[PDB]
């Protein structure tokens, strides 16, 4: 891939005691894109052949995999970014009803993804072994995970990023 | 093995217009012993590793094997013989309440084994493929058999033998 190949005329800088946010926020935008693609198919890209189930039950790997991973972290992120992406191309150029409502959209989205995330991954963690007692899964069986530490780390990162994103997003939203 | 190694003094033969049965019946006794041991562990002796089940279900071979073969033919025979065996050593020597009741026992046993047999192997046959839909056997699966023709043949034999056994057994039971 390659994303962004024309940014040369940016001599105009800020002078006020504000609009520091847009710097921080474009930086976090670009950042999160890199951070994503660089580790995109490279942490969670694997986790299909990595959910070993101690059994001889047919299918129970698939069963428990959806049971505990309806969706992977990186998708909720990918979405979180895209919904939080549309205000970016908006704020690309501003001076001359929406504009600040773009800022607010950007806030509330990111908030939503945080909440529903912690609803799903309660404990902000990756259990080393998830058991499973699904229908075909004849009793409570065991179902492993690879690299739970890893995924936990990058999750801590992205959530911290979400917090700072919103804090400057809102710190300039709160101009009154 | 070796069974029977002392029979020399049998010069006394029958002269009446009866007791032909005891000849026929001792012959059928000895016969069925040979017939058994010669093919004993040699037709049904195999059928443990011979009940292939098209599946990947664990255990479903054992499951369906008991399902369709609670017990093998040769056991019902083995029993049929033994219950029908005790009157033999009785009638070994006779001239001088039981004696004829031994004959009747010998009849009714053999009859019973015939009936319950056909209850179990209905159709006097060996199906080339028995399906199976047991609990672990996830859907209706297939479960093969080896040498069904063979076993069918020797079954036809033993049942015919049962018929003639009883017919002479009773033909001399019916003396009045």
From Swiss-Prot, chains A, B:
InterPro entries: Connexin, Connexin26, Connexin_CCC, Connexin_CS, Connexin_N, Connexin_N_sf. Disulfide bonds join 53-143, 60-137, 64-132. The keyword Protein biosynthesis does not apply. It is found in: Cell membrane; Cell junction, Gap junction. Ca(2+) binds at residues 42, 45, 47. Changing residue 75 to W: In PPKDFN and DFNA3A; does not affect protein trafficking; affects the ability to form functional channels; dominant negative effect. Pfam families: Connexin. The keyword Heme does not apply. Belongs to the connexin family. Beta-type (group I) subfamily. A hemichannel or connexon is composed of a hexamer of connexins. A functional gap junction is formed by the apposition of two hemichannels. Interacts with CNST. Forms heteromeric channels with GJB4. Structural component of gap junctions. Gap junctions are dodecameric channels that connect the cytoplasm of adjoining cells. They are formed by the docking of two hexameric hemichannels, one from each cell membrane. Small molecules and ions diffuse from one cell to a neighboring cell via the central pore. This is Gap junction beta-2 protein. The lineage of its organism: Eukaryota, Metazoa, Chordata, Craniata, Vertebrata.
């Amino acid at each position: 891939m390659d994303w962004g190949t024309l940014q040369t005329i940016l001599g105009g800088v800020n002078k006020h005691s504000t609009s520091i946010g847009k710097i921080w926020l474009t930086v976090l935008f670009i950042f999160r894109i890199m951070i994503l693609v660089v580790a995109a198919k490279e942490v969670w890209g694997d986790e299909q052949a990595d959910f070993v189930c101690n059994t001889l039950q047919p299918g129970c790997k698939n069963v428990c995999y959806d049971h505990y991973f309806p969706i992977s972290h990186i998708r909720l992120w990918a979405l979180q970014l895209i919904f939080v992406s549309t205000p970016a191309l908006l704020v690309a150029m501003h001076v001359a009803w929406t504009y600040t409502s773009s800022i607010f959209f950007r806030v509330i989205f990111e908030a939503a993804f945080m909440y529903v995330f912690y609803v799903m991954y309660d404990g902000f963690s990756m259990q080393r072994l998830v058991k499973c007692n699904a229908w075909p899964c004849p009793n409570t069986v065991d179902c492993f995970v690879s690299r739970p530490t890893e995924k936990t780390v990058f999750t801590v990162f992205m959530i911290a990023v979400s917090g700072i994103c919103i804090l400057l997003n809102v710190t300039e939203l709160s101009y009154l």
